[PDB]
Amino acid sequence: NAQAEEFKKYLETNGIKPKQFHKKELIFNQWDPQEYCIFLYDGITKLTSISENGTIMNLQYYKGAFVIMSGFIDTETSVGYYNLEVISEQATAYVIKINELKELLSKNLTHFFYVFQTLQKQVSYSLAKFNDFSINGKFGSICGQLLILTYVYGKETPDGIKITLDNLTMQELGYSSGIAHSSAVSRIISKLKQEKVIVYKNSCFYVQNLDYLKRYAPKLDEWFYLACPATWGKLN
Amino acid sequence: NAQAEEFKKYLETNGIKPKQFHKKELIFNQWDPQEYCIFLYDGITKLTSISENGTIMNLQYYKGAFVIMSGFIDTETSVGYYNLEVISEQATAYVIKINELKELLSKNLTHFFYVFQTLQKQVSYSLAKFNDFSINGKFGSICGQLLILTYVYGKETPDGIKITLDNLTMQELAHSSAVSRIISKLKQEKVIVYKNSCFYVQNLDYLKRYAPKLDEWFYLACPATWGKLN
Ligand code: NA
Ligand code: NA
Ligand code: NA
């Protein structure tokens, strides 16, 4: 990712160094009065919110390279009471106090705009998820998640398009599709295996009918086409 | 909104004139090869999309002053097949080609930050809505839409928080039967009341209880407006 590699250079030039986090650590947390800009260079994270009683809500997933800002750029105060949790085994991120970020986006607008554009991708991703859910419900949500996982992590193999993630847990898949409890996911994964859209084998989902997923996640497929044409192009 | 009025002046200083739109017009549409930055100065709009069958979906609502960009700032291509439709009687907007927005935000980083922060409000708004839906379902979504109406248009009165929006506009805010039952249930329970041709919120705490993450979003995003009624 060319724009991401250029942004990594600009940060290191300016003396910001990558940090390594391991699974379950919070890159930023909902109780911290200091807010940050996170350049997630490598790894998979999720955004969570934790209620007073302990219930964890999974709100959004990100993969490196991406940018996540916990505070508004002008006021520097929280945009919501959120954590960024590492769900891959390891992740690498540049962690920038928001006041320090402003100075740096100041003097190089090429990078101001790279971050701007990521927020736009976030916005339209949330709208596409809402639009697919409104039409095809939870079933379409899960198709969407399988679809994007296939675009990003699929390898063509004799068994289908293998979704090549470690510990791709059924529970994590449901959370990414906006569904909390496993009773609903089981139903849907059962139908998808039944109609022979997916298969489970080597700890992995294989996708054997990619067109069926496109069919039920049309607005997320359109988002991927519009926002990630190069990746989309690999399986179209 | 001081930040927004300063942006309006920046636009005009650079020669950009306001355009006027009427209800049901599209300020931008999903078929135009040119994408735009809309500075919606006055009025109420909705973002819409069309499914294969020709069914229209209402995705989001925006009120002046706000910024809505139909294309990515770097590549200038569509963020999604979306239309921006006017819902108030009238709307005033500044309509800027994306390439020209960049040059404009380049010269002035106060206004750069103003626009950037509207994206951030959008992002967080969507997540707050989703969180509320994941706790209380469609009932929470509707409580949350009325909560933001109350904070944005409400004025305290002896009869409660009057919603200072014309009635025709107010009811809309397509025509799902399940939505209409939710609204009328809040009326039945006297959370919002019709009196003397106006609508009054008489139980704000009830709305706050069922749209807690949207209430938090407004506190964090618009603390002064939140504060007026809390
Ligand atoms: Na924080
Ligand atoms: Na357009
Ligand atoms: Na107050």
Residue numbers in the entry:
A (entry chain B): 2 to 237
B (entry chain A): 2 to 174, 181 to 237
Sentences copied from the publication:
The major regulator of virulence factors in L. monocytogenes is the transcription activator PrfA, a member of the Crp/Fnr family of regulators.
The prfA gene modifications included three previously characterized amino acid substitutions as follows: four of the ten mutants carried the Gly to Ser substitution at residue 145 (PrfAG145S), one carried the Gly to Cys substitution at residue 145 (PrfAG145C), and two carried the Leu to Phe substitution at residue 140 (PrfAL140F). All the previously identified PrfA* mutants, i.e., PrfAG145S, PrfAG145C, and PrfAL140F, could grow in this medium with G-6-P, as could the PrfA mutants PrfAL140H and PrfAA218G, whereas the strain carrying the PrfAA94V mutation was unable to grow. The PrfAG145S, PrfAG145C, and PrfAL140F mutants showed the highest expression levels, followed by PrfAA218G and PrfAL140H. When grown in BHI supplemented with Amberlite XAD4 (BHIA), the wild-type and PrfAL140F mutant strains showed significantly increased expression of ActA compared to bacteria grown in only the BHI. However, their structures showed that each of the PrfA* variants had only one folded HTH motif, with the remaining structure residing in the PrfAWT conformation. The PrfAL140H, PrfAL140F, and PrfAA218G PrfA* mutants all had a folded HTH motif in one monomer of the homodimer but an uncollapsed central core structure. Consequently, we suggest that these mutant structures represent an intermediately activated form of the protein with features characteristic of both inactive and activated PrfA. When superimposed on monomer B, the recognition helix in monomer A is shifted up to 6 Å.
